[PDB]
Amino acid sequence: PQSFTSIARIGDYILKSPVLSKLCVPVANQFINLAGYKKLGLKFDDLIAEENPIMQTALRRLPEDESYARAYRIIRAHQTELTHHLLPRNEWIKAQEDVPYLLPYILEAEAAAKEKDELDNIEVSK
Template sequence: MNSFAPSFINVVNKRPWLSKLVAPLASWYNNAAGYRQMGLKADDLISEENETVLKALRRLPPKESYDRIYRIRRATQLSLQQKILPRSEWIKPSEDVPYLSPILEEVIAEEKERADLDTLAVVKKH
């Protein structure tokens, strides 16, 4: 897992009883957080102040990139006006699918591989 989106999902998924306990709490939290009421997806909340995230953003398809910028600008405008979207325009949980996280994980894996290869020590056997 990456440091951009800390997660305990593996721990929760390994224990069905814990999953049943945490699922309603997670659903409540996502609704209470209010980002969906502003028309944002969870991946829209990932900060762009990191070179790794910027690399992932450059790999987004043009339509997805445009949609992300639109959602963020609309949410900023709503925040300035201290409003939320009409209920019909809220992001539904089924629509809140990761679009940046998978790309971000690829970039992190590539950077780790590059760092591992750059620090690779060649040992000659005599």
């Protein structure tokens, strides 16, 4: 899959540009509301697939208090979905709470894997 380093490179270019941000941001906001993961009580970083080594590394480096809350949001959402209901509207994730809490741990583990890999296939001068 696509790297979060590449996702951030494209996104930052779109956001720094005034004309593109005024044209692509409203589309992205209503793509978020139509998806409907907040209505089950989840933040976006709960949805990222975790069966790969870069993502297993990021979850160990996470603090204990943020890790206990993530486990509860995931259990609550499974139970909400087997009953085929939604949560009460006063328990929906708000926009100001949908923060990228795990992205810095991911970008740090990715940058180290690229540095290690370049060093294992170096062309040396004389």
